[PDB]
Amino acid sequence: RRRKKRTSIETNIRVALEKSFLENQKPTSEEITMIADQLNMEKEVIRVWFCNRRQKEKRIDI
The enclosing domain of 20 has a CATH number of: 1.10.10.60
Q: Which residues contact 25 (CB under 8 A, 6 or more apart)?
A: 54, 57
First to last CA, the chain: 34
Q: Which domain holds residue 1?
A: 1-62
Nearest to 21 by CA among 40, 5, 56: 56
Whether 40 contacts 5, CB under 8 Å: yes
Experimental method: NMR
DSSP string over the chain: -------S--HHHHHHHHHHHHH-SS-HHHHHHHHHHHTT--HHHHHHHHHHHHH-SSSS--
Whether 21 contacts 58, CB under 8 Å: no
Task: For 3, list phi and psi in degrees, rounded to 5.
Answer: -85, -45
Tally of domains within the chain: 1
The CA–CA distances, whole Å, from 17 to 1, 22, 40, 47 equal: 26, 9, 12, 10
Cβ atoms < 10 Å from Cβ of 50 = 20
